[PDB]
Design an enzyme around this catalytic site. Structure first.
Site, PDB file in Angstrom:
ATOM      1  N   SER A   1      66.442  93.795  25.729  1.00 28.74           N
ATOM      2  CA  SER A   1      65.461  94.959  25.465  1.00 28.74           C
ATOM      3  C   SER A   1      64.161  94.518  25.121  1.00 28.74           C
ATOM      4  O   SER A   1      63.025  95.204  24.840  1.00 28.74           O
ATOM      5  CB  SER A   1      66.108  95.709  24.128  1.00 28.74           C
ATOM      6  OG  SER A   1      67.232  96.330  24.665  1.00 28.74           O
TER       7      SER A   1
ATOM      8  N   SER B   1      65.936 100.652  20.578  1.00 20.80           N
ATOM      9  CA  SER B   1      66.287  99.917  21.895  1.00 20.80           C
ATOM     10  C   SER B   1      67.080 100.819  22.831  1.00 20.80           C
ATOM     11  O   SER B   1      68.161 100.940  23.307  1.00 20.80           O
ATOM     12  CB  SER B   1      67.144  98.803  21.838  1.00 20.80           C
ATOM     13  OG  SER B   1      66.601  97.648  21.285  1.00 20.80           O
TER      14      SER B   1
ATOM     15  N   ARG C   1      69.975  87.772  13.920  1.00 19.80           N
ATOM     16  CA  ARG C   1      68.894  87.507  14.760  1.00 19.80           C
ATOM     17  C   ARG C   1      67.394  87.520  13.357  1.00 19.80           C
ATOM     18  O   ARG C   1      66.566  86.463  13.656  1.00 19.80           O
ATOM     19  CB  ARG C   1      68.497  88.542  15.576  1.00 19.80           C
ATOM     20  CG  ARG C   1      69.531  88.593  16.867  1.00 19.80           C
ATOM     21  CD  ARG C   1      69.327  89.827  17.811  1.00 19.80           C
ATOM     22  NE  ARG C   1      69.582  91.109  17.014  1.00 19.80           N
ATOM     23  CZ  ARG C   1      69.559  92.292  17.796  1.00 19.80           C
ATOM     24  NH1 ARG C   1      69.195  92.421  18.995  1.00 19.80           N
ATOM     25  NH2 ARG C   1      69.579  93.327  17.036  1.00 19.80           N
TER      26      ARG C   1
ATOM     27  N   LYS D   1      61.243  95.749  26.532  1.00 20.81           N
ATOM     28  CA  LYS D   1      60.528  97.157  26.407  1.00 20.81           C
ATOM     29  C   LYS D   1      59.025  97.023  26.005  1.00 20.81           C
ATOM     30  O   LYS D   1      58.324  97.760  25.945  1.00 20.81           O
ATOM     31  CB  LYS D   1      61.467  97.601  25.352  1.00 20.81           C
ATOM     32  CG  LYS D   1      62.570  98.291  25.811  1.00 20.81           C
ATOM     33  CD  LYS D   1      63.254  99.143  24.781  1.00 20.81           C
ATOM     34  CE  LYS D   1      64.596  99.772  25.250  1.00 20.81           C
ATOM     35  NZ  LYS D   1      65.505  98.911  25.712  1.00 20.81           N
TER      36      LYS D   1
END
Lengths: 242, 242
Positions: free
Chosen positions: B47, B95, B227, B50
């Site tokens: 993602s 996302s 993350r 994007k």
């Protein structure tokens, strides 16, 4: 529609303060405030004028972009954050007046007045000093006239480049998390009575945006944190933020 | 110059993880990471694609602005935030794949390919489906190549309109306060092994900006919060944030 909601006065009362908080629901196109009169009374914009000042400086090339540095002039002033180099971002974050005074001088009296006529900004009167009329001059603007102006900026509809409007709206960034975004500008009018503190901008949510403009009687710099505190309390009360 | 800092691996250890965190000090033009190897290994962007996808969609008119609405297609998917209407802002926040799959289809194979050559983005390979190559195709990009792309975006130097680049950077906004601003994009590669999570973007400070790009092995959805957690720990350790 403009609806009064006098329950908010309790947030000013608890801090022994007086002010107005004006909210505008962009989706439902409805306004809310604790004081309809004071919401349309015009005060000095003080440092909230840094929004239109930046727009004009950017559109006229006085400022190349938001990263251009403005060397400190070496004159040590009694605000520690002013005694540094600044770009448009930090200059706005810390309300660095002497930087925007240099902007206004280069902009000039004719261009400044001509652009605020286009902006339809407050009484459009720059009478006073070219480099201080927003602190002690003839310019005056109400909380509702702030929101009306902020909506034009938000939608990139002011008579300046879209680029200018996107740069300033970036510099207005104040706070953000997974729940909301706040782009706003603080102000403090002290050279002319009544001394007031400002906070104007908007709260961006997933599915809506709430434009806001508040001012409150502010006799001392010690209570400036109430501009945001009282505003955020009203937002919680309306379940706009957690 | 690029210097290694394997001490950060302890933040991966404590969470039973393996990964890389790559930092770039823009001012001093110096790079730091706990693993130069994995910092140059190319993975599926997932993602995080994007970012270039939005730039291309905006520049080609596929997307008019960040407020344009994209109705839900009615296909109920197993992620609740996808089963509603979205603009470019919310689509990136959550996302929302099917929205960006529609973008890619209207962009097309030829224009998509030409724009990733201009962006100099990863291996520039869209082999596969135009609407899923960043999830299960031939596109590959490293953490350093991410930073290189993010640095071009930050300074409005990608081969697209500055307008697109200012809109996307607004959409990347994730977290901001008086101490820092974070604009970033999360990713989760799951269709092809190794499963990894992404976080890329930058921390904007008063006097600097720190570009960062991390990926980590991600066998289960349970560890996706790492993350940001692991990345923020490294940022604290370097006194980049409090």
């Amino acid at each position: 529609e403009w609806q009064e909601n006098k329950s908010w006065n309790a947030h000013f009362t608890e801090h022994k303060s007086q002010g107005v908080v004006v909210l505008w629901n962009e989706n439902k196109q409805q306004g809310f405030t604790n004081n309809l009169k004071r919401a349309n009374q015009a005060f000095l914009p003080a440092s909230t004028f840094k929004i239109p000042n930046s727009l004009i400086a950017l559109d006229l090339g006085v400022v190349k972009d938001e990263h251009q540095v403005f060397k400190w002039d070496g004159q040590t002033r009694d605000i520690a954050t002013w005694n540094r180099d600044h770009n448009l971002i930090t200059a706005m974050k810390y309300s660095v007046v002497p930087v925007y005074q240099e902007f206004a001088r280069q902009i000039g009296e004719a261009r400044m007045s001509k652009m605020l006529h286009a902006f339809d900004y407050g009484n459009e009167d720059i009478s006073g000093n070219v480099d201080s009329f927003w602190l002690d001059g003839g310019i005056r603007i109400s909380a509702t006239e702030q929101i009306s102006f902020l909506r034009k900026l938000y939608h990139n509809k002011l008579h300046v480049s879209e680029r200018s409007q996107r740069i300033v709206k970036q510099a207005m960034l104040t706070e953000a998390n997974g729940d909301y975004i706040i782009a706003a500008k603080t102000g403090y009018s002290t050279r002319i009575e009544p001394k007031i503190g400002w906070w104007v901008g908007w709260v961006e949510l997933d599915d809506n945006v709430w434009f806001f403009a508040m001012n409150m009687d502010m006799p001392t710099s010690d209570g400036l944190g109430l501009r945001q505190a009282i505003t955020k309390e009203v937002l919680k009360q309306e379940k706009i933020i957690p």
